[PDB]
Amino acid sequence: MGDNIVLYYFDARGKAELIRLIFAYLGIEYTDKRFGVNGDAFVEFKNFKKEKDTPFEQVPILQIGDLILAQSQAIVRYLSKKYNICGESELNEFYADMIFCGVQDIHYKFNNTNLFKQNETTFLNEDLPKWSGYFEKLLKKNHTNNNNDKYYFVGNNLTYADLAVFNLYDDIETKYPSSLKNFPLLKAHNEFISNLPNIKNYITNRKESVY
Amino acid sequence: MGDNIVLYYFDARGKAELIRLIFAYLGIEYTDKRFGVNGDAFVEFKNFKKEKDTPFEQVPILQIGDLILAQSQAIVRYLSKKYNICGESELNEFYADMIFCGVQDIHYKFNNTNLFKQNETTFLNEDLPKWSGYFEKLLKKNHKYYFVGNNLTYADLAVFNLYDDIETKYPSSLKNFPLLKAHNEFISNLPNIKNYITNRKESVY
Ligand SMILES: CCCCCCSC[C@H](NC(=O)CC[C@H]([NH3+])C(=O)O)C(=O)NCC(=O)O
Numbered sequence: 313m314g315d316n317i318v319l320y321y322f323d324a325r326g327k328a329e330l331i332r333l334i335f336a337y338l339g340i341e342y343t344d345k346r347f348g349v350n351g352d353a354f355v356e357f358k359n360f361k362k363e364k365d366t367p368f369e370q371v372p373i374l375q376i377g378d379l380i381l382a383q384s385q386a387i388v389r390y391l392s393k394k395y396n397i398c399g400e401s402e403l404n405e406f407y408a409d410m411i412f413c414g415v416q417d418i419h420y421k422f423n424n425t426n427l428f429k430q431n432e433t434t435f436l437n438e439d440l441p442k443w444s445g446y447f448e449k450l451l452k453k454n455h456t457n458n459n460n461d462k463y464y465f466v467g468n469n470l471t472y473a474d475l476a477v478f479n480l481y482d483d484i485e486t487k488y489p490s491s492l493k494n495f496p497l498l499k500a501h502n503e504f505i506s507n508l509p510n511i512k513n514y515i516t517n518r519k520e521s522v523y
Numbered sequence: 524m525g526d527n528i529v530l531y532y533f534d535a536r537g538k539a540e541l542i543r544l545i546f547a548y549l550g551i552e553y554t555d556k557r558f559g560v561n562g563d564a565f566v567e568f569k570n571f572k573k574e575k576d577t578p579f580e581q582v583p584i585l586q587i588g589d590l591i592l593a594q595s596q597a598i599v600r601y602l603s604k605k606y607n608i609c610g611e612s613e614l615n616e617f618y619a620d621m622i623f624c625g626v627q628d629i630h631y632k633f634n635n636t637n638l639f640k641q642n643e644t645t646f647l648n649e650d651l652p653k654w655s656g657y658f659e660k661l662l663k664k665n666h667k668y669y670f671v672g673n674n675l676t677y678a679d680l681a682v683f684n685l686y687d688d689i690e691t692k693y694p695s696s697l698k699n700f701p702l703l704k705a706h707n708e709f710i711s712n713l714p715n716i717k718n719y720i721t722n723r724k725e726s727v728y
Pocket residue numbers: 326327369370371372382383384385624628
């Protein structure tokens with residue numbers, strides 16, 4: 313009967329936000345369990361590992377019925393196939409995958425700066441402008457003569473890749489609000505994703521986070 | 524008949540080895556292009572990016588006919604679906620995927636020690652034993668040793684590759700994990716793999 317859905321993570325966006333964005337977009341009901349809200353995060357996490365048989369002792373963990381799912385990326389791809397926001401072709405699914413992997417390379421770099429105190433200068437002057445150019449270009453290839461007011465990285469429909477790129481820049485802007493000034497398509501794309509009803513309803517009612 | 528397959532990367536195993544292992548296992552023909560083997564890796568790489576329109580200016584890059592494919596993990600997943608070495612059921616494909624990302628987590632830590640010379644003891648005493656235990660435990664649950672289903676999946680190759688790369692520096696690693704060891708021994712003896720390895724030229728990373 314579909315069973316109960318529970319997402320386990322710390323009281324942060326981090327590696328669980330994209331999963332939350334997918335649920336919001338699909339309008340899926342689930343319990344957003346966050347360590348630290350009702351109790352001490354450290355103690356909640358330790359107890360959690362004793363109660364649940366996780367494969368790698370890491371979160372996020374997605375529980376569907378009695379099913380325990382680990383590794384955010386795998387969970388994301390699994391949810392995308394099941395709710396069809398993966399791409400109408402094996403080839404378009406590859407492209408969405410490739411872009412998601414790209415989001416990973418640049419996001420990892422942002423994390424090293426915004427969280428682990430790594431030189432922000434290299435990020436702001438070499439990594440951010442460069443990777444933004446890559447996405448702008450990929451967006452340029454699949455637009456204008458493919459879509460109008462709507463912007464998608466793959467095909468003519470929303471894929472988790474659009475959600476991943478939106479999440480990436482939504483996060484980068486909580487630190488550098490002016491990042492997309494020189495990237496029109498990328499800027500219009502994120503504005504577009506942010507205004508989808510289900511997404512808009514989740515963002516505006518989402519609690520602010522540290523990361 | 525079909526389209527020429529060309530794999531571009533540096534003269535190393537690194538992020539292209541799993542793909543090469545998949546091609547070997549499948550018995551698929553392709554040109555293994557390696558920067559530096561003939562010309563100068565630096566120069567070849569520079570010329571490469573001018574000749575091919577790559578999405579992120581990084582390699583590996585798999586070229587199939589006119590198609591340009593980037594990002595090693597996306598490539599591995601694409602090839603596995605196209606050649607049916609992915610989890611067959613939706614849930615099994617998820618398990619193969621989850622295990623593969625688990626391999627990336629620990630492979631990432633090996634790279635920081637093996638290549639960017641980070642702390643070698645942290646990896647050896649805290650990371651490696653712990654992760655080998657996770658893999659050993661995943662084998663137990665689903666138990667010819669296979670992580671998912673009763674057939675070979677790219678996850679099996681990913682695990683094999685991980686420990687094969689780790690062993691180039693720490694040989695007696697998985698001595699205390701029988702299942703995991705039998706599993707890698709098993710994969711290494713598959714005719715197509717066994718043959719590919721003995722003919723494979725050694726290299727740092
Ligand atoms: C320096 C790394 C900072 C980690 C940022 C917070 S995320 C929480 C952390 N989880 C992961 O790193 C999961 C990685 C995994 N690849 C995924 O994407 O799901 C965890 O459970 N960690 C358990 C632990 O550390 O014991």
